[PDB]
Amino acid sequence: CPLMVKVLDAVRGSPAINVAMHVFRKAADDTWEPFASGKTSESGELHGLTTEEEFVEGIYKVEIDTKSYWKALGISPFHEHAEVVFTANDSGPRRYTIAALLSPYSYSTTAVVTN
């Protein structure tokens, strides 16, 4: 699993379940092409987005639909979504875990990159 996303809810102290996200990859013409999508599980994790072979060097964007998450909980949040944009595999294949910690008016995101 070369790309995994974990989302946590800082209001409830729980995984953020059923959070939709879309991954894009920058094309040679500088447009964002769709790459993968899914939603987080009961553990707040989304696995299986891509494979080692398909996850080539490039600039990737993970768009996490945080607004829909908060609205379903009755909360009108500040952000439309959380965006994570990064260059991947520029020094060879790596495994990426992208984590997001969500509050209505704030989020934090980190990356753990392993060889």
Added chain:
Amino acid sequence: CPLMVKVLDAVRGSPAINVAMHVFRKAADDTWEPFASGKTSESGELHGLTTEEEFVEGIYKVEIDTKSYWKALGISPFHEHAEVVFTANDSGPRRYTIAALLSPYSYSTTAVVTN
């Protein structure tokens, strides 16, 4: 000053100085048109991006060039930039302060919305 951006550096414990950013407003064709830009001051702040009359309801994106900041410090970063996408809404007088706390592999962003 209806919109201010403040950027902090979590490695140095300092304002993040000379950080470039661009602000975009979402157009009707779902594209991002440039709206304002600047670089942070010695206090890590960027003021004067817009005026009350110009800052109408809509979806705005603040793109903070964090990669160039870490590059100038000789530190290898994860993100291409930090993106803050939000809806500005008219409900009484509202001033928006977007704050971002930067680390090489993580960032946090919050919004302080006041009257």
Added chain:
Amino acid sequence: CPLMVKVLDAVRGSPAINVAMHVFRKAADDTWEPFASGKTSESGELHGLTTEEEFVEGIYKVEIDTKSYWKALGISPFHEHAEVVFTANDSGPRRYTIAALLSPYSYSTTAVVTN
């Protein structure tokens, strides 16, 4: 003002107002003696805790009563308080701003140390 504390609320997108805090200085017998205290203003800030002459090198602890804050808002919190423990060091003129961003089950704290 060599020491200022700023507290923000990530659920409401606002300064965290009327948050009590106590500052302690570590004594030679490894106990915490009270040094200063106050409550945050309507801007979420607490100034005037100490003076340049009094704020000598040592280990300091800022205990922020986050539990009482969330209780007053009717929101069940995780932490009893938020603790910030640090060494103040003389290396040129130094002003310390401790910032804390509060959510019910999470907090973030940073230090901005300037001249």
Added chain:
Amino acid sequence: CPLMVKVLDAVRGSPAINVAMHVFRKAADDTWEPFASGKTSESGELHGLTTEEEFVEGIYKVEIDTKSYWKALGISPFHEHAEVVFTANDSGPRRYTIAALLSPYSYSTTAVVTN
């Protein structure tokens, strides 16, 4: 495993390995009694601190020795340690995951509480 701690390094984008921490439990006389200790593994996690039977209701403090971690990497950080203080099991047994994201001048901590 009713109590687990995970520590991440926001400068390197990696688990924070070999981070020492000590857990204390508040006694009836309001002193902090030692409860458990250990260090994080290669995955940045510390498991096996306690058991369901031993982890009774009470106020617990997790003291994470972040200063020693940064110093071994050549960095002089701001904080002496990261402290996480919380009431546990007040509504019956729960499982607690305490996470800390570390930077030299900042840290974030969250809790995931499961039934």
